[PDB]
Structure 1
Amino acid sequence: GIRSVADRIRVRMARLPIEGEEGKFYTLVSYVPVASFKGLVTKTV
């Protein structure tokens, strides 16, 4: 709902080239579901 959000969220954002113009990039934030957030650090996939 609108009144509550998860306490912690793990996301993966990937920088990809824009299809139209090759000079510029754009970010795509996606959702990575995990069972528990213990022992998870910032990983460059």
Structure 2
Amino acid sequence: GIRSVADRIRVRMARLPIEGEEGKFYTLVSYVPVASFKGLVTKTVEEAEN
């Protein structure tokens, strides 16, 4: 609801080129649910897979 939000939230922000113009960039913040926030640090996610 509007009165309560989670104490901690884990997000995944991904900088991507804009589909219209490739020279422009935009962010896409997504939700990554976790069982607990213990031991979770700032992890940089580079997939780099075929």
Which TM-score band applies after superposition, normalised by the shorter structure? over 0.9
Deviation, 1:44, is 0.3
CA distance in 2, matches of 1:22, 1:39: 37
1:22, CA displacement in angstroms? 1.2
Under a length normalisation based on structure 2, what TM-score does the superposition of the two structures give? 0.88
Count of aligned pairs: 45
5+ residue gaps in structure 2? 46-50
Structure 1: 5+ residue runs without aligned partners? none
Q: List structure 1 runs of 4+ shifted beyond 6 angstroms.
A: none
Secondary structure of 1:29 counterpart? strand
